[PDB]
Amino acid sequence: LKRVVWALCFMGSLALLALVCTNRIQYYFLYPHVTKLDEVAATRLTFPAVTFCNLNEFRFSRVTKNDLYHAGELLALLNNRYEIPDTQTADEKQLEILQDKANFRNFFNMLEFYDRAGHDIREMLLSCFFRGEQCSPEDFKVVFTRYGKCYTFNAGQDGKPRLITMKGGTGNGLEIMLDIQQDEYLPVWGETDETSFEAGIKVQIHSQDEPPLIDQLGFGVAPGFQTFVSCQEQRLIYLPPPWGDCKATTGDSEFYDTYSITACRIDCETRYLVENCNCRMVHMPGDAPYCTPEQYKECADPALDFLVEKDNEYCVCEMPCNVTRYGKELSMVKIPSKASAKYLAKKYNKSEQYIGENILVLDIFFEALNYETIEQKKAYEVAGLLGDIGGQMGLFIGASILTVLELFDYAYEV
Amino acid sequence: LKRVVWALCFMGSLALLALVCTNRIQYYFLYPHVTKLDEVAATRLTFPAVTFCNLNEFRFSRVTKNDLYHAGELLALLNNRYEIPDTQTADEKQLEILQDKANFRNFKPKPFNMLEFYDRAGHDIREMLLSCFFRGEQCSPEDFKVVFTRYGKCYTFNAGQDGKPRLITMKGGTGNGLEIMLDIQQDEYLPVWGETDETSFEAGIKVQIHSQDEPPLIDQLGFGVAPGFQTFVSCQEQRLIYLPPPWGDCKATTGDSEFYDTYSITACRIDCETRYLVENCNCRMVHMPGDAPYCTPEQYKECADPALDFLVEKDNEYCVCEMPCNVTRYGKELSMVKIPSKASAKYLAKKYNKSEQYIGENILVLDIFFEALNYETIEQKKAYEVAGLLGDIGGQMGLFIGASILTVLELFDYAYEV
Amino acid sequence: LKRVVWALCFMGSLALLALVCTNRIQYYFLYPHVTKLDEVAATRLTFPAVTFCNLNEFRFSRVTKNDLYHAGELLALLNNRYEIPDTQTADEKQLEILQDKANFRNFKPKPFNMLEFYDRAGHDIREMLLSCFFRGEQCSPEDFKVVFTRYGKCYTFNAGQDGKPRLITMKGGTGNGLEIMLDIQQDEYLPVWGETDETSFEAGIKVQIHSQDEPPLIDQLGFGVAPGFQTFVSCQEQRLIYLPPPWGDCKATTGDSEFYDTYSITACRIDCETRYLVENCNCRMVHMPGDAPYCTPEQYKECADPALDFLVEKDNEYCVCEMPCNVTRYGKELSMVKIPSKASAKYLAKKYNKSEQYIGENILVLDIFFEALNYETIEQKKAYEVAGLLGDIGGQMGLFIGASILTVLELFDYAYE
Ligand SMILES: *[C@@H]1O[C@H](CO)[C@@H](O[C@@H]2O[C@H](CO)[C@@H](O)[C@H](O)[C@H]2NC(C)=O)[C@H](O)[C@H]1NC(C)=O
Ligand SMILES: *[C@@H]1O[C@H](CO)[C@@H](O)[C@H](O)[C@H]1NC(C)=O
Ligand SMILES: *[C@@H]1O[C@H](CO)[C@@H](O)[C@H](O)[C@H]1NC(C)=O
Ligand SMILES: *[C@@H]1O[C@H](CO)[C@@H](O)[C@H](O)[C@H]1NC(C)=O
Ligand SMILES: *[C@@H]1O[C@H](CO)[C@@H](O)[C@H](O)[C@H]1NC(C)=O
Ligand SMILES: [Ba+2]
Ligand SMILES: [Cl-]
Ligand SMILES: [Cl-]
Ligand SMILES: [Cl-]
């Protein structure tokens, strides 16, 4: 009777060992991870790259008759028949100018047009200060995006050293006073695809390793306010397969030195436009030929829109394992104060109304001298699995790997 | 002498096995969990439900003499004695209109209902909605569903209720989302001539982005949007998975309420309020769902409001709402630009037959979108399972004395024989 | 032949046991942690402390002839030669006041104190606070406690100091929190007639929401609020628990500061600054606490500012502040509505005896509240404790060779012979 209960105990015990052991086996083969949050204090933080565009693509005073002829339909100033839109709510001077530029009696490169006709940082930048020291417009690098001629501070490209800040708070960062030049905005007399009612700027704070994608990743800043942007640096570490989904091999594209999800997106877009239309848009990089305004209308735009809708699987961009992101909180104060409106108006030779409708101050800084780290960490390593299987194997039947080998011997002999 | 060193080694080893084993056992009965954060890319994201209210509860031009009679004291337009309060800063025309509506001489009171009053006197979306765009294509006011909240007649875009299928977005960024130009109609706001608790100085709208599975709770979970700016809202979809007891505190059971199909903490709160008011005052407020009779303004004054305040103050034990295990939250970042530009002010004023002053002080543009086509997942994960517990106890039990459950069974064998 | 294959199995098994065992040992000695996020519903929340400053440091109408004499150069009202700068784009009356105040002819100076000057010249809460409400009941200016910061005379609601009990809120949403209507008094702002480093063009207030256990740090940790809007601030209470060494880097000890009862990273920062300024310049600025003598504007000019700037870069290793293990933080989301409505603009103008222009450029309403009655917890949790190490080592030690600590002790016993 004792040997019978002993045998049943060995059978049931081996069953428990079976289900527990297979439990840990399957759990290990889920390849699970868990998240580790940490906050790291530092004596220094590398200041990010800040790209901003004016919401107005190009200045009205810099457009010429040839530009109206070639790109008049694309810029939405002229119709398909090369005629002025509805004369409702048209400035007399503006309408006379446009009719004169559209004489088209006895009368082009897209990047020339954007580079020359776009808003000049030398006129927009009323003041610049970085860590309390003056900066020049030469510090901003020209980048061409969907919004037109845009500028990036602390771009760190072409070998320029990335800036550091050794103090946190509103004073110790980038601080620019900009004039959005609302008088240069395209007159809107009729509904158009490009028609916009907004006035202000659009900003993206990003690491120097990734290109700007300001039409998607940007936030707005309105004139008449000083907006503060508190940034918090975040360092993210992901896991490759089979744990997570990250790109272990960087596989950097020829266009950009460092791989980024954004750079992969605009690379896919450029390649698609080159394949379908044999030309590239203004924002796209490389040495490829730029599109003509006729090419824009009949090929480029429908190809991009069709690329978004028709085949979303075609452009699959994996996320890199090391990603530096910047968190940001916005707040505003009124500019200018009643005590300062007169001095600004006289300093920049403008009316007090103009200052009210055209001046914005951007204040970008790190809240404190620290950065957060978010790391995906493996939850079950092979040592832990062998340890658990060994522990349960020794608790339930007390066997070992040598024991199973010896059982194969005794079974083999008999 | 060797048997003494063996006895000491076995005793100390058995003690260490005791405290370490009880350590791992107690850790298991804490039922600990740790968090797994992940970011998942998707080719499509279901666009959320967007509820917005005007900060002004009802339009001044739509209020009638009967409304002043029944709900005049509640609407704060008339005093307790059915007479107009202090006329400070009163436009002659507006004050004459109100004085005419409050004549109450040989007046036969018509029947009055709170939901009728809010439904007709509230701001009409057909008048507020100057333009709507979703994914670059036009939307109708028919996409907006009428929802009654504490703020009055409010509207929910993409509510996904009453059999309408929920909208999706296949691209991220400012263009590819909801974008509505609204006229808040500041001319219809109730005149404020005397100070009161209900008096407010704000002008604009209030918006809540929420899942279609939960009803709006705009008085608590909404953010404000001011006229004169285009406000961008970047959203990040978050999928949360919690653990039930004894690991965490979540609602494991579906717990369907009579009022709402899917369980949500918001639905649990407004359900608790509805039940409390129905039992205490035998009437229901405007925002509450069900089939109960709505309160009369007398019931509002003498029962409903003090009943809700007393429910909030006396004890939270009556309404204890646990969070469901599967929760979809939407994160949002706000930014602003000025509207309209000088190049557009005249065109807007002429397009909607208003003065440029009016456009400047009444037009707001709301742009709601997903920053990118991905969603975050936050999952509570169990940290110590019974297989791992048995593995650790077996490992240490085998390390210190090298015994097994069969070994302890044999020692109990000799104990039974003894 | 059987003993040879057995020997190969025992050798490979002992090698694998070696590398796996050293693996778990090294993983334990990394002292790793992982994070536990949780959300807890609550019936009550302790309302935080709210500090706000006017962006204008001191009122122009309260500055006196003696103040101009001693601190005229420091306040940027007077030039290096104690003379008014260029009068370009200066209102005739506005400049007349200053020219009369800066006469300095047959003027017999009187004693001067920087903290008296800020306390008397700063914006008075009794004039700024147009209305106050907490949980729907009225509050007085006496509820705000005076704190001196780099921005000047500032105020803290629900400071919980001097024996006052901390306030709680039992409901979430816009109504059920602090709600103040403020007049920033833009007419009292310092005139800006000439370019200077100290010149600023902003108008408004700056707010910091913080725990009562920490002093404000508004020059670094504050956000702005603009006039002409009601700004809603939704707060989310976060409770954080960190690990001390060797797992993480937190304050294991109480860390008693001389100036503050409770330790906070901010209190550590202003402590480092105050001590440094007392050692190098023998005086403290207005914002600094303690019992040292306050600096004179000459001391400010020739010692204090360059000493602080030298402290930032040269001694960046010198001020190291460790983070406390238990920290209550408040997260915030900002949104705005327009104030006043056309239906209320004139009523406000007559209620406060001001023009509608003034109301438009001077009135702001701040609405601070909890989004919901819950709090998040973020805890660093030890990932590998010694019990788990011993369990894993025993499991693998028993799987590969089937040995125990008694087995190795017996092997050393036989080796002893
Ligand atoms: C909560 O969400 C999870 C998925 O995130 C649901 O789990 C799925 O349940 C269905 C059954 O209806 C299975 O077919 C799927 O395979 C499950 N997915 C996973 C990943 O396990 C879960 O059912 C949801 N819970 C509730 C109450 O809705
Ligand atoms: C990624 O970043 C971490 C710091 O966050 C660094 O230690 C590591 O070397 C980087 N590279 C890789 C491949 O992890
Ligand atoms: C100042 O503005 C006026 C008005 O346009 C202009 O005529 C004048 O040239 C400007 N002065 C300078 C120095 O540019
Ligand atoms: C514009 O509105 C006013 C207000 O009543 C009306 O009198 C006028 O006829 C309207 N104009 C047009 C063109 O509809
Ligand atoms: C209102 O202010 C004016 C000056 O602006 C003053 O003359 C008048 O006495 C004030 N009235 C009251 C009641 O304070
Ligand atoms: Ba020195
Ligand atoms: Cl998992
Ligand atoms: Cl736990
Ligand atoms: Cl580690």
Residue numbers in the entry:
A (entry chain C): 42 to 148, 153 to 459
B (entry chain B): 42 to 459
C (entry chain A): 42 to 458
The authors write:
Acid sensing ion channels (ASICs) are voltage-insensitive and proton-gated members of the epithelial sodium channel/degenerin (ENaC/DEG) superfamily of ion channels that assemble as homo- or heterotrimeric sodium-selective ion channels and are expressed throughout vertebrate central and peripheral nervous systems. ASICs exhibit a simple three-state gating scheme, populating a non-conducting resting state at high pH, opening upon exposure to protons and quickly desensitizing, recovering proton-sensitivity only upon return to high pH. The homotrimeric splice variant ASIC1a is highly enriched in the central nervous system (CNS) and participates in numerous physiological processes including learning and memory and nociception. ASIC1a activity is modulated by endogenous divalent cations including Zn2+, Mg2+, and Ca2+ and the modification of ASIC1a gating by extracellular Ca2+ has been an area of active investigation.
To further probe Cl- binding to the resting channel at high pH, we soaked Δ25 crystals in 150 mM NaBr. Consistent with 2Fo-Fc density maps from Δ25-Ba2+ and Δ25-Ca2+ x-ray structures, anomalous difference maps subjected to real space threefold averaging did not indicate the presence of a bound Cl- ion at the canonical thumb domain site. Placement of a Cl- ion at this high pH binding site off of Lys 77 and Lys 422 partially occludes the narrow extracellular fenestrations that provide access for Na+ ions to the channel pore and that undergo a dramatic expansion upon channel activation. Furthermore, a recent study demonstrated that Lys 422, positioned less than 3 Å from the high pH Cl- site, is important for inhibition of ASIC1a by ibuprofen, indicating that this region of the channel is critical for proton-dependent gating and serves as a binding site for channel modulators. When we carried out anomalous scattering x-ray crystallography experiments to study the occupancy of the thumb domain Cl- site at high pH we found no evidence of ion binding, demonstrating that the thumb domain Cl- site is unoccupied at high pH. The absence of a bound Cl- within the thumb domain at high pH is likely due to conformational changes at the Cl- site resulting from the pH-dependent expansion of the acidic pocket. Additionally, the rearrangement of thumb helices α4 and α5 to form the resting channel’s expanded acidic pocket at high pH disrupts the subunit-subunit interface at the carboxy-terminus of α5 and alters the architecture of the canonical and highly conserved Cl- binding site.
